[PDB]
Amino acid sequence: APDSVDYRKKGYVTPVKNQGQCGSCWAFSSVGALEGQLKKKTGKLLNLSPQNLVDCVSENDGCGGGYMTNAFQYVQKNRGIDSEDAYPYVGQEESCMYNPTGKAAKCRGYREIPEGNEKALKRAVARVGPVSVAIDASLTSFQFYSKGVYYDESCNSDNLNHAVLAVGYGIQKGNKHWIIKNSWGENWGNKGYILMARNKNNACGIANLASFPKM
Amino acid sequence: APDSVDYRKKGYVTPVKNQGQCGSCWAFSSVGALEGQLKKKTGKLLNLSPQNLVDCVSENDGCGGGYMTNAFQYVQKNRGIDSEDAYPYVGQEESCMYNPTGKAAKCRGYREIPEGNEKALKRAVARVGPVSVAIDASLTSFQFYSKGVYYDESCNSDNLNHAVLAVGYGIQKGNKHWIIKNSWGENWGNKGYILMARNKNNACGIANLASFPKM
Numbered sequence: 077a078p079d080s081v082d083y084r085k086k087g088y089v090t091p092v093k094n095q096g097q098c099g100s101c102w103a104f105s106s107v108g109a110l111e112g113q114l115k116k117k118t119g120k121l122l123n124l125s126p127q128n129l130v131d132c133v134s135e136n137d138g139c140g141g142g143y144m145t146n147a148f149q150y151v152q153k154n155r156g157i158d159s160e161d162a163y164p165y166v167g168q169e170e171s172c173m174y175n176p177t178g179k180a181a182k183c184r185g186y187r188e189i190p191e192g193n194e195k196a197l198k199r200a201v202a203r204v205g206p207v208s209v210a211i212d213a214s215l216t217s218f219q220f221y222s223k224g225v226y227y228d229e230s231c232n233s234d235n236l237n238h239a240v241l242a243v244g245y246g247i248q249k250g251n252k253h254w255i256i257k258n259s260w261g262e263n264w265g266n267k268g269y270i271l272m273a274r275n276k277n278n279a280c281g282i283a284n285l286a287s288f289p290k291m
Numbered sequence: 292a293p294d295s296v297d298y299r300k301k302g303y304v305t306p307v308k309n310q311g312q313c314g315s316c317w318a319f320s321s322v323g324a325l326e327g328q329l330k331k332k333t334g335k336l337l338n339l340s341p342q343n344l345v346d347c348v349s350e351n352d353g354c355g356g357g358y359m360t361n362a363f364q365y366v367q368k369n370r371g372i373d374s375e376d377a378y379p380y381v382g383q384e385e386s387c388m389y390n391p392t393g394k395a396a397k398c399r400g401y402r403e404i405p406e407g408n409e410k411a412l413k414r415a416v417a418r419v420g421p422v423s424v425a426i427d428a429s430l431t432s433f434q435f436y437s438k439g440v441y442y443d444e445s446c447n448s449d450n451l452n453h454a455v456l457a458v459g460y461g462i463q464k465g466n467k468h469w470i471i472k473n474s475w476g477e478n479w480g481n482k483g484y485i486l487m488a489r490n491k492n493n494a495c496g497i498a499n500l501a502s503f504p505k506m
């Protein structure tokens with residue numbers, strides 16, 4: 077694996093979205109990972125539908141949270157997921173309005189990164205592409221993040237509560253990091269992104285519940 | 292009165308929730324106590340709405356924290372609280388959207404446990420049911436709790452920063468404890484729970500800010 081990787085430069089990452097007043101971070105994380113594999117397999121980058129996931133993944137809790145793996149499973153068993161244009165994001169749970177006509181991607185399943193292994197996560201990102209990850213984003217320090225490589229001793233890897241997307245990794249000012257795409261809008265963090273400490277004892281639990289879809 | 296009590300066995304406790312990033316621990320603590328009394332009064336166990344409290348208890352600070360007593364006061368004055376289904380949790384403060392038709396419980400008052408009295412808290416849990424309590428959960432040792440009876444001399448009884456639910460009490464390997472339900476997801480601690488030292492000089496301030504609603 078390369079010392080650094082940034083899928084944003086390769087056109088594998090769509091613009092930063094804003095999930096609004098809906099606990100759908102898991103759906104944005106999921107579509108982000110799907111968009112990466114779609115681009116890698118078809119060569120086209122397009123926005124997939126997080127609303128499709130919020131409304132149709134029965135095992136998850138819609139605007140109340142959910143597992144990225146359940147989303148991948150849904151896409152697989154559903155034989156597809158709609159594009160954002162065909163199933164627009166509205167910010168609240170609605171009745172399932174999925175339709176094969178707007179299908180823009182499929183899923184053959186998913187894999188979970190060995191729990192707590194950042195080196196494994198690194199390998200996955202390098203070989204597969206953007207990977208869905210879960211972290212503790214409950215600290216005010218995370219909420220008001222502006223720049224630099226984020227590390228807070230108070231982060232709790234035993235309290236995973238937010239789903240985001242690892243689109244790469246590298247180092248800045250001698251500090252290794254993960255390039256994380258959030259879904260709180262472009263005005264949050266650094267243009268919607270946050271560099272999170274890498275190889276710093278699994279800070280914020282970045283490698284505790286990571287996964288990627290098979291396409 | 293009994294040596295041991297566990298309301299989870301009696302079906303007075305709903306599944307462990309994940310509060311996300313919103314500082315709503317007080318709301319989950321409040322609904323937990325309300326859920327217990329509702330089961331007792333109607334025989335039914337159901338999720339009540341923490342979002343309803345976050346958005347409508349103007350006396351509190353929404354995602355910035357709040358008092359469980361102010362929550363009970365609101366339910367009383369408001370003539371009710373919604374079920375989770377009728378007012379779903381989204382992990383961010385919204386405009387107050389209380390639905391009167393979705394009312395699932397009422398509150399005719401509440402009482403505050405005499406400050407620092409663990410004996411009184413014990414009697415309350417035994418007689419009333421689950422009780423809302425506040426503790427010092429700022430220690431790394433608390434964050435990474437996994438098993439046994441939690442005790443850390445560095446805990447500060449007068450640093451009440453986290454709201455949880457006491458669903459019982461007992462003794463493990465000779466160590467008296469309180470059975471505490473957190474709102475950091477089922478993967479935190481021991482299936483979302485933590486046993487905290489009981490009768491150990493009011494450890495972590497367990498009996499300094501405890502209260503329960505009446506139905």
Ligand SMILES: *[C@](=O)([C]([C][C][C][C])[N]C(=O)O[C]C1([C]C2=[C][C]=C(F)[C]=[C]2)[C][C][C]1)C(=O)[N]C1=[C][C]=N[N]1
Nearest residue numbers: 099100101102140141142210237238309311381382
């Ligand atoms: C976001 O962080 C969601 C919010 C959940 C609470 C509204 N969290 C989330 O989905 O995390 C997913 C898990 C933990 C989990 C699993 C199942 C659940 F039902 C709930 C939580 C981490 C790995 C799985 C989020 O959307 N944040 C947000 C809310 C409002 N704006 N941003």
Ligand SMILES: *[C@](=O)([C]([C][C][C][C])[N]C(=O)O[C]C1([C]C2=[C][C]=C(F)[C]=[C]2)[C][C][C]1)C(=O)[N]C1=[C][C]=N[N]1
Nearest residue numbers: 214312314315316317352355356357425452453454
């Ligand atoms: C939680 O511990 C909240 C967070 C408040 C700060 C964001 N604390 C809390 O509400 O505690 C309630 C008190 C103390 C208090 C009173 C009034 C306030 F305005 C603030 C605090 C204890 C008894 C009353 C919490 O939600 N933690 C959490 C946030 C994200 N994940 N977990």
